[PDB]
Amino acid sequence: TSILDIRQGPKEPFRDYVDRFYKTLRAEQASQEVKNWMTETLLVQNANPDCKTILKALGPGATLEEMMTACQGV
Amino acid sequence: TSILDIRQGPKEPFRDYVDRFYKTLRAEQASQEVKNWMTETLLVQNANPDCKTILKALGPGATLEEMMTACQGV
Amino acid sequence: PIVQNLQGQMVHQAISPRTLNAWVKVVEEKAFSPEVIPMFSALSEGATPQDLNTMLNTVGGHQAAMQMLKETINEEAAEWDRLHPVMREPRGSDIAGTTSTLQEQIGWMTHNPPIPVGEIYKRWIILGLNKIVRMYSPTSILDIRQGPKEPFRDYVDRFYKTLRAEQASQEVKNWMTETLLVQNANPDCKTILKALGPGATLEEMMTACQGV
Amino acid sequence: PIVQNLQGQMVHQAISPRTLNAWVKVVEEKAFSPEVIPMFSALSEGATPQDLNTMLNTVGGHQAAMQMLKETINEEAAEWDRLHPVMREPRGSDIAGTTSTLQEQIGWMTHNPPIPVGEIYKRWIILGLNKIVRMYSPTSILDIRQGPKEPFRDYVDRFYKTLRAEQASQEVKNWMTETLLVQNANPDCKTILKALGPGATLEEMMTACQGV
Amino acid sequence: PIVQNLQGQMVHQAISPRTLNAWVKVVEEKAFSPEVIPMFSALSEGATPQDLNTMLNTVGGHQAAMQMLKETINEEAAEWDRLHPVMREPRGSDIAGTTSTLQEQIGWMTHNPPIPVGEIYKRWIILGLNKIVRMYSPTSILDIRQGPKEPFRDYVDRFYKTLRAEQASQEVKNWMTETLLVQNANPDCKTILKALGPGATLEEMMTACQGV
Amino acid sequence: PIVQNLQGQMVHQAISPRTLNAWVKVVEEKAFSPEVIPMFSALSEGATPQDLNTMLNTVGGHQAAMQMLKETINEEAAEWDRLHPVMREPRGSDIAGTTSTLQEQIGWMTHNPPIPVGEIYKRWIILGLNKIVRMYSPTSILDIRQGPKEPFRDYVDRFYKTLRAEQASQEVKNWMTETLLVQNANPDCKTILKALGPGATLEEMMTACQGV
Amino acid sequence: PIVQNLQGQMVHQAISPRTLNAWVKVVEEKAFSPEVIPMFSALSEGATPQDLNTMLNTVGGHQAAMQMLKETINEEAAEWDRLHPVMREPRGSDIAGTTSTLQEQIGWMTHNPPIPVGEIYKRWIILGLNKIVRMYSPTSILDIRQGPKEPFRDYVDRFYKTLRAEQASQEVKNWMTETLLVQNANPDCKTILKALGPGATLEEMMTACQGV
Amino acid sequence: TSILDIRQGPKEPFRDYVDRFYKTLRAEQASQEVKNWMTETLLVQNANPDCKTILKALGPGATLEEMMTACQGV
Amino acid sequence: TSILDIRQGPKEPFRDYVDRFYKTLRAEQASQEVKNWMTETLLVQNANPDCKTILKALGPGATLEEMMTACQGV
Amino acid sequence: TSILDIRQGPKEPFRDYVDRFYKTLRAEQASQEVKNWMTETLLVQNANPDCKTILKALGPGATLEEMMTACQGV
Amino acid sequence: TSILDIRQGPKEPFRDYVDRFYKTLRAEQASQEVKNWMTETLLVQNANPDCKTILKALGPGATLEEMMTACQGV
Amino acid sequence: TSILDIRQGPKEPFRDYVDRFYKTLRAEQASQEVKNWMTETLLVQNANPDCKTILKALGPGATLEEMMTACQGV
Amino acid sequence: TSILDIRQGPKEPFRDYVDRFYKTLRAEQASQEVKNWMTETLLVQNANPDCKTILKALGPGATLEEMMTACQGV
Amino acid sequence: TSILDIRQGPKEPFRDYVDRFYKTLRAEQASQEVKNWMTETLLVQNANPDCKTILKALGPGATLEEMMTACQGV
Amino acid sequence: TSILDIRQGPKEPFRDYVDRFYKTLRAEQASQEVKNWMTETLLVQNANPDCKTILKALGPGATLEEMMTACQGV
């Protein structure tokens, strides 16, 4: 699995998806600005729709803390 | 249509509603203090229930760029 | 307040216990509806900054309201020092009455011409109370709509009450009373309010809508 | 108001903070029902034009009411100058207390005979408050009808309250109390009110309709 | 009212603005229920005829009530001149305070022994207010009946309130409280009120009917 | 009340018109609920017997209440003469202020040590008002039961209000608050009030029953 | 309170009869809701311990409340003697005003610098009133939940009112307003209050929830 | 019957009711101030709905002669 | 028709009956006291019952003005 | 009919109602201050719902010429 | 049974109820001021509806001899 | 009939029974203390039950006036 | 089409009728007072009934601005 | 779960609820004044209806040892 | 029966069980600390469940008075 094809399932809790995403990101180990892009754009774009709407409600530039505490009810 | 009648439909994209709103706001050509008030309060109040909560979460300081960026995912 | 002594000197008279209890009834029972600003302005009327602090100690029970007052008073004291760079000089915290003595406050209020540090601080307080009154508004003006069988007098009262709570400058208020007040009327009144045309004063609107 | 100093000179005493708060409660809580005119006339009782302006600053929150007062005061000041063409002379804006000093107002109020610039300006204000009370009337007198099970005392109270808000001269009021009050009664009372004949006083009407 | 000056002379102090506003609240808000007589008698307490006229100017808004006062005052002034045929003499219209100067009123009130023209005129006014309170009664005493589940305390309150509005002399009042109060009770209370027998005081009636 | 004159002599100041109107509002509007005793005791606070008679003249409209006051005052004046057999001597009817001059009352109140004829007569009046408050109680304490969904704070308020109207000595009151207050609670509260055991203070009872 | 005599000496003026009646209305009619502390603090404002005892004699009708005051006053008087071991010395029961003369109280309040035995005893009383206000709370803060159609302004008012009755220190209050106020909101408001994030001030919470 | 129980029947002539009223009033023999009050107010209040309006139209000053003269036509 | 046999019909308005009555009275032209008796007694006695009750509610001695304004609703 | 009973029918022309109103106003012959009040307020209040709104839109200053001119089209 | 639970049955003789009441009052052995209050008020309030009215008619001053003498006929 | 066997019927008004009782007592003309006993005890004991309860509600020693006014509703 | 026969249809918005009217008036180019008459009288008389009533509610002499803003809801 | 969501089930042992409560209280790691408040008030308020009454009967001073000792029998 | 096998029945009132318990304890006459243990532990443990819960609601160390007054409603 590339980081590009890690995706959140319908039932999958956001914290499980985030852990899969960042483990894949850590292994795939692209350069820092590619990691910035992936953690800002792919992390949201590959979230499931119910998380993706809650994430975009935060506006870009939020921390991972704020993203996880936001999605924790989904 | 008066600007007070420009209301976002339940499935209408926020960008299409903003386009209608600011077109009507330009046609009505109320003075700038009134336009400022309308862009700050009325644009939010007339958004549909999906977008309206996103816009409130940005706070009154939101800029039209931020408002559209956030609502683009609805 | 300030009174003349029998020796002719200006001297402090403490704000009376029932004037303070009247202000307590205003702060407690009115929940910062807009009446709380005229009633403050009235009960404060002669007040020195020491007396005004004695009044604000009542708002100190509403810790959320009290910090907005503290903020706006600190803000205006700083801006005062900013516009007025340095019989001592009336500095911002001296006008607030934290720094100044009572004799300094009365002195400022009784030089010729006086420096009205009471009325100044009272104006900073009223600007803070305006923020609090705005926060405690139950509705925005866009939520105020006339009922299907509600008198136009009641709807006008609700409208102007809400309009008076809100931040709107006079130009925005004028636009609201000209256009929201018509738009948000019930259809029976809205017909007449349109038929008068846009140049109608509130008197003409009300006397036309009377009993509808 | 005016008081005697210990030196025997007439001098200003400021209108008390709780008298102002009483007037604020009148302006705010009564929504310009006709009670607001007797209560103004009472709380104003000793007032100089400076004090009357301090009271009108309370109405300044009701910008629609306040401009009717400004209008009627400017109108009466102009008409005063028109009837009274020119120890200085009391001009219209001097009676309003925009132009005059406090010492000028008290002087006029304490010459022999005095010029009662307080009671004059107070009368122009009461004429403006009459306009405002009329605008805020919930109903016209023709809308006041008795309920099918409403006491005639309640209906008389509603009627005379509305009659007291309206512009009617005393001749028109007399016709209304003689004929509308009968016409708009419920049929049970209307029978008795007719059977008394047209020359019945309100006392005779009420004591006949008592408990119906 | 009358006060002692620092020079020792008796002198007029004008009836205070909030005492007048208290009287306005009595006249306006209580609709001439019987409370309006004790409250008049209280707020009037020190009043000269000039002050009493300043109070009656409040009733002048209720033109039907005001003419009953004018009538009863003219009637009693005439009867005063009739019983008292002629440091000037206190004539009826002088006691009314239309004819007399303020200094004449205070003089009469401060001769030794005084002529209490204030308390006299105040008594004629209270006799007029009694007529008005009677006219505004919502019910006659014969209409006052206890509800099927109404406390005897509430019914006694309603009864004595109505009894206090009515024209009944004390002998007629005594008969009413002895017999109507029993007759018009609900059957549960009426049983006990009969079982006490006719010589029962109101205390004995109430404590027996308590909680029924 | 009594005040110091500028000449240093103690002198009468008449009980103020709005203090009398405050007492009228207490007598009229509260229907002798137990609040009427603290409010009497407060408004009376400085009163001479002349002033206390001026207050009782307000109760004179409630002829049933007024005769209980007359009775209790005559009773206590007689018992005063009985305990105190005979700068004149303060006799019972002199303390009542029917017999004594105003100067005699103030003299007694300002000898060294004083005879507090005001506070004495005020205590006889309060004993009469206690009888009247007891008569006007809507319920006996045995009738006070908690509703099935009534807060224990409301029930405690109703209970202690009724307990405060009744004749119970402090020992009987203590037994009532210990046992009736539990017995008459609803079953939800009654369970907890029993589980605390009999030695529970009202604070412990209320904080346990809070929100039940 | 304390006033300056015409001879320049500080002297007692008794707490006015209508200030006492205002305090009676606070104790009687408000049932120890938290307003009773600001209103005490206001009406007390100039009070000597003799005056404060005259105010507490009003609470003496609420024997359960009065013993909590007695307790807290005795407790603080003992702790005062404990921190302050022994122009006489102000001992605890002297500050309570059981032991001290009136002249001793005014002396302490007018030495240079003064010992503010009035404001001290007033602070012990306010600590007792806080205990009583807490006992009479109708609900704990955990019981305060928003209704399904209740304005967030009303719910905030209920919440902060209850929060103000409770014993919570400011750190616990801060946690409550940050987290209970969100948790106990209805789901419509709770969504927005969560979407603002945890760092939201009450102003930001209210203006976002306005009209929901 | 007390005087308060003496009430005019719906078809009873006013003269027969007055005869019952003043007979009962003589039997009860209340003092003259109370009798005056009863003859003035209670005699009117206890009349039937037909006569009661006639009596009110005469005003409180009506004399028993005038009251009976007026009600004779009912 | 004698004045004695002029009578108001069931549907006849009072003013029409009064005009018939006074025209007959004017023609029959009895002496003044007989006219007084007829205008006070026959005028009421020959009114229809609904007018006759309203007339007797006025009490004798009323003017013809007051009699007509009273009956005008019948 | 009193002037207070003169009310415009739902299909009645405003000119026919004005003719009835001013005929009744002339018959009642109330004093001129009362007539002025009736012509200003009561003529408007008694108009039918179609005309009444037209008359209110002219304001209280309307003259009978203007009132009739405006209502001629109903 | 507490004394507050001792209540007279609808057909129970007043003497049998008094026997139960004063037996329970002796067992509870509350202090004499409380006993006095209970004998004066509670004994009356707990009587059945037939006897309770008899006891109230004697007034608060009734003595147990008088109370029993009166209720013996129920 | 002896005074001992004079008794009130079920429908008999108390005043009729009292008149029969005291006429029999007057004729039978026992000594004064026997009359006292009969007028206090037999008069109540031979009343019908509805009167007898109302009489005992008065307590012994009442006058005949009070006994008759009490029973007058039965 | 003469200006005399330009007429508003049932569904036709007032602004479309006004534009047809004034284009025809501009082409037909009668003298100024005839144009005044046509723009005041024919413009209203040839409006459809729902507009014609709203126009006459304005009273004669209104501007074309006020006429168009008035009819814009029809 | 927040500590405010930790509520005792109707059949859940008080020791198992306390274990959940103090585990969540340790995880949330609010400052000690807030923990003190939660252990004193919230632990009681969130108990089930059986245990809650037991805990209230111990008073606010109860210690967790005493609270558990008492509720062990539920 | 040993004190160990004295037990409260389902219907048995607590005072009857306590009397059986303490009579058995008095006869079996174990040493004082064994009696302390039995009166604290066995007395509660052998109570019926409805009493046992009410007893444990008191917390250990209560007097026998408080235990009996507590269970008296069961």
Residue numbers in the entry:
A (entry chain B), B (entry chain C), H (entry chain C), I (entry chain B), J (entry chain C), K (entry chain C), ...: 148 to 221
C (entry chain A), D (entry chain A), E (entry chain A), F (entry chain A), G (entry chain A): 1 to 86, 96 to 221
Task: Quote from the publication.
To investigate what effect the hexamer–pentamer switch and the tilt switch have on host–protein binding, we next repeated our structural analysis on cores incubated with FG repeat containing peptides Nup153(1407-1429), CPSF6(276-290), and Sec24C(228-242). We determined structures of hexamers from peptide-bound cores to nominal resolutions of 2.6 Å, 3.1 Å, and 3.1 Å and associated pentamers to 3.1 Å, 3.5 Å, and 3.2 Å, respectively. In contrast, we do not detect any density corresponding to peptides bound to pentamers, though in all three cases, peptide density is visible in the binding pocket of the hexamers immediately adjacent to the pentamers. From these observations, we conclude that the hexamer–pentamer switch described above prevents binding of the FG motif in these peptides to the pentamer. Superposition of our peptide-bound hexamer CANTD structures and our pentamer CANTD structure confirms that residue M66 in the pentamer would clash with the binding position of phenylalanine within the pocket. The first switch alters the FG repeat binding pocket between the hexamer and pentamer, precluding FG repeat binding to the pentamer completely. Our structures in the presence of host peptides show that this change prevents binding of FG repeat peptides from Nup153, CPSF6, and Sec24C to this pocket in the pentamer.
pmcThe mature HIV-1 capsid is a conical, fullerene shell that encompasses the viral genome. It is constructed of a lattice of approximately 200 capsid protein (CA) hexamers incorporating CA pentamers at 12 highly curved vertices. The surface of the conical capsid is dense in protein-binding sites that mediate interactions with host machinery necessary for transport of the capsid through the cytoplasm into the nucleus. Here, we present structures at 2.6 to 3.5 Å resolution of CA hexamers and pentamers within in vitro assembled conical CA-IP6 polyhedra from multiple lattice contexts differing in local curvature and geometry, alone or in the presence of Nup153-, CPSF6-, or Sec24C-derived peptides.
